[PDB]
Design a protein around this ligand. Structure first.
Ligand SMILES: Nc1ncnc2c1ncn2[C@@H]1O[C@H](COP(=O)(O)OP(=O)(O)O)[C@@H](O)[C@H]1O
Ligand SMILES: *CC(=O)NCCNC(=O)CCNC(=O)[C@H](O)C(C)(C)COP(*)(=O)O
Lengths: 78, 490
C-alpha cells in the first residue's frame, strides 16, 4: 500500500502508537475503528483516491484489516 | 400444564398479536432477502411462528418468572421468541450477538436465567452449565442443554408479571406486561402511527429502543422494518434499504443521521416515502436537525424524551421550521396518563417559568424495580413528595427541566455527571474507576470531547491497546482514546 493509504487509516485508529507499525492483518476495530469512524475512513479514501465503493464492497469484512481494505480500494479503482 | 396468559390479561403476546385476529393478512415485518428482494411476514404468519416456539418452550417445564436470555438481532424469529416467552410468563433478557463475552457472563451471573437461546447460526459458546441452551430458527427450537427439572408453582399469569429485564454492575430494569401495554395504549391515543406505517427500527435488540419500536409497530398493527447493522452502518446501503422496503417512519438515536447528513445528503433527500422520524436518547444538534428537516420537508420529526425505567415520558413534533434563534428544543408535554413534577433540592414544586427542577414522573409504565437491588430501587422509585402518606411512588429521574410559557418542558441536563454516548447512559466515574484498576494507572478522567462527541480517557501512569481490551465495561462505555498524561489539570 502507498504512503497516502497508511496516513489516512492511521487517522481513524487512535490506539495505534505513532511509533508502532500498521500491521496489514491488524483488526482495525481493536485499534479504535468504530461504526462512525469506519464511514469517515470510507469517505476519506473515496475523497483522496476519487474511488467509489460499490454497495457490495461496503461490508465489515472489507474494512476489518488494512490488507482487506487496501485490496478492496484497489478493486474499486480497477 | 404450562401456564399461558389469558386474552383479557395485559401481556405482550395478546397486545402485539391483536392484529393477527383483526387484520391477519397485513404485514408485521418487511425484510430484504440475500438477493435484494423485499419479503413481508403477516400478523397471521408471525402468530403461527410465536405459537410453534411457545409449544416448544412449554415442553422445557419452566415456571412463570423463570428468565430467558434471547441473543439475536431484531428478526421475525427473535420477536416470535420474545412473544412466546411473553405468553408463558417467562421474562426475557435481550442481548446482541456483538455483546462482549465478559458482559454476557455478568448478565448470566446477575440474572441467573434458566435458559439462553440464540439463532441457528449464532456463535455464542461456553455458556455456563447451570444455564439451559437452545437454538431457534426455520427448524423450530432445538435444545442443547435442557434447563434443570423444577416444580411449577405459578397457576395463572398476571399483568404485574415481568415481560422483560433490560441490562459497571449490570442494572436490570424489570418491566411488567401492565407497564409496557400502558405505554402503548397512551401512544395509540396520539394517532402518531397507523396500521399503514412501515417503521424502520435501528437500535440492536439489547437496547430498550428496539423493544419500544417492536411494541410500537406490532401493537398498532403496523409493519416493523428492522434495519440490520450491515445496512445501517453504511449510509448508501442504509438509504437503499429504506427505499427498497418503503419505510414510512425511521426511528433511531440522532447519531444514525450524522453519517448520512455528512456524506449522502443528496440520496437522503430522495426518501420520498418517509413521512416521519423519531429520535430519543440524547440532544440532536440544531444545525444537523435543520439540515435533516430541509432535506425531508414532508417528514414529521418527533423528539421523544424518556428513560429505561418508564420507557417513555414526553414528546414534541419539532417546529416547522426550526426558528433560527432557538437555543434548545422542547421535550414537549407528558403523554396522556403521565404527569411531571419539577422539584427543587427540598422536594418543593418549581412554579416559575424558566427555572429548572428535578423531574419526578407519575407513569402507568413504571418499572417494577432494579433486579436484585432494592437499595438502588428505593433511591429512584420514591414516596410521592406531594403525597407521601398514600404509599404512591414517583420516578426521581436525575434529569433537570424547566417549563416554557405554554408549559412545554425543556431538558436542562442532570444533577450528576451522567452523559449520553449514542443515547446510552454513561457515568464517566465508572470508566474512570475501571481504568484506575488497570495495572499501571494512578489517576484517570473520562470526558465527552467534540461530528458526534467521543469518550476520551486521560490517565496518569503502557499499552493503550491492552488498557482498551481491559475496558473491552459495555461497548459504548469504551474510550475512543486513552492518552497517558503527566498530571490531571484542575
Ligand atoms: N430527547 C431527549 N433529549 C435529551 N436527552 C434525552 C432525551 N431522551 C432521553 N434523554 C436522556 O437519556 C436518559 C435516559 O437514557 P436511557 O435510560 O438509556 O433511555 P432513553 O435514552 O431511551 O431515553 C434521560 O434520563 C436523559 O438524560
Ligand atoms: C434504553 C435505550 O434503548 N436507550 C437508548 C439507547 N441507545 C440506543 O438505542 C442507541 C442504539 N445504539 C446504536 O445504534 C449503536 O450505539 C451503534 C450506533 C449501532 C453502535 O455503532 P458502532 O458504534 O458499533
Amino acid at each position: 500500500w502507498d504512503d497516502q493509504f497508511e496516513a489516512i487509516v492511521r487517522r481513524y485508529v487512535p490506539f495505534l502508537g505513532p511509533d508502532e507499525r500498521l500491521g496489514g492483518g491488524s483488526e482495525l476495530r481493536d485499534l479504535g475503528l468504530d461504526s462512525m469512524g469506519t464511514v469517515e475512513l470510507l469517505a476519506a479514501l473515496e475523497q483522496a483516491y476519487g474511488a467509489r465503493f460499490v454497495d457490495d464492497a461496503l461490508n465489515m469484512e472489507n474494512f476489518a484489516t488494512p490488507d482487506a481494505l487496501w485490496a478492496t480500494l484497489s478493486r474499486m479503482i480497477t | 400444564r404450562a401456564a399461558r396468559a389469558r386474552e383479557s390479561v395485559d401481556n405482550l403476546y395478546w397486545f402485539m398479536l391483536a392484529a393477527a385476529n383483526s387484520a391477519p393478512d397485513t404485514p408485521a415485518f418487511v425484510t430484504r432477502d440475500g438477493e435484494g428482494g423485499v419479503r413481508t411476514l403477516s400478523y397471521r404468519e408471525l402468530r403461527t411462528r410465536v405459537d410453534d416456539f411457545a409449544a416448544a418452550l412449554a415442553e422445557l417445564g419452566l415456571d412463570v418468572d423463570d428468565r430467558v436470555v434471547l441473543e439475536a438481532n431484531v428478526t421475525p424469529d427473535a420477536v416470535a421468541m420474545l412473544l412466546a416467552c411473553s405468553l408463558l410468563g417467562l421474562p426475557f433478557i435481550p442481548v446482541s450477538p456483538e455483546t462482549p463475552s465478559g458482559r454476557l457472563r455478568s448478565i448470566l451471573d446477575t440474572a441467573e436465567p434458566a435458559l439462553f437461546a440464540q439463532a441457528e447460526d449464532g456463535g455464542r459458546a461456553d455458556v455456563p452449565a447451570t444455564v439451559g441452551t437452545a437454538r431457534f430458527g426455520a427448524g423450530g427450537l432445538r435444545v442443547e442443554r435442557a434447563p434443570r427439572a423444577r416444580v411449577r408453582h405459578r397457576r395463572e399469569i398476571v399483568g404485574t408479571d415481568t415481560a422483560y429485564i433490560i441490562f459497571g454492575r449490570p442494572k436490570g430494569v424489570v418491566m411488567s406486561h401492565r407497564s409496557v401495554v400502558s405505554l402503548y395504549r397512551a401512544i395509540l391515543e396520539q394517532g402518531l402511527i397507523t396500521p399503514e406505517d412501515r417503521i424502520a427500527t435501528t437500535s440492536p435488540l439489547q437496547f430498550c429502543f428496539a423493544l419500544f419500536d417492536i411494541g410500537l409497530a406490532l401493537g398498532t398493527g403496523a409493519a416493523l422494518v428492522p434495519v440490520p447493522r450491515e445496512e445501517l452502518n453504511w449510509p448508501r446501503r442504509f438509504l437503499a434499504f429504506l427505499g427498497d422496503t418503503g419505510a414510512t417512519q425511521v426511528h433511531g438515536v440522532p447519531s444514525i443521521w450524522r453519517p448520512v447528513l455528512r456524506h449522502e445528503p443528496e440520496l437522503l433527500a430522495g426518501l420520498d416515502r418517509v413521512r416521519g422520524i423519531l429520535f430519543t436518547g440524547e440532544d440532536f444538534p440544531l444545525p444537523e436537525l435543520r439540515h435533516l428537516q430541509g432535506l425531508l420537508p414532508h417528514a414529521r420529526i418527533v423528539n421523544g424524551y424518556g428513560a429505561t425505567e418508564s420507557m417513555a415520558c414526553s414528546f414534541t413534533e419539532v417546529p416547522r421550521p426550526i426558528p433560527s434563534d432557538l437555543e434548545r428544543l422542547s421535550i414537549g408535554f407528558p403523554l396522556p396518563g403521565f404527569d411531571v413534577s419539577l422539584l427543587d433540592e427540598h422536594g418543593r414544586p418549581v412554579e416559575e417559568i424558566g427555572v429548572a427542577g428535578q423531574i419526578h414522573l407519575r407513569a402507568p409504565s413504571m418499572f417494577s424495580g432494579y433486579w436484585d437491588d432494592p437499595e438502588a430501587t428505593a433511591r429512584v422509585l420514591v414516596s410521592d413528595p406531594l403525597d407521601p402518606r398514600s404509599g404512591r411512588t414517583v420516578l426521581r429521574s436525575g434529569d433537570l427541566a424547566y417549563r416554557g410559557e405554554d408549559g412545554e418542558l425543556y431538558f436542562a441536563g442532570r444533577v450528576d455527571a451522567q452523559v449520553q454516548i449514542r443515547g446510552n447512559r454513561v457515568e464517566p466515574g465508572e470508566v474512570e474507576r475501571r481504568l484506575l484498576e488497570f495495572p499501571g494507572i494512578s489517576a484517570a478522567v473520562a470526558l465527552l470531547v467534540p461530528n458526534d462527541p467521543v469518550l476520551h480517557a486521560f490517565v496518569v501512569v503502557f499499552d493503550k491497546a491492552k488498557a482498551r481490551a481491559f475496558c473491552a465495561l459495555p461497548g459504548y462505555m469504551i474510550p475512543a482514546n486513552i492518552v497517558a498524561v503527566d498530571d490531571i489539570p484542575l
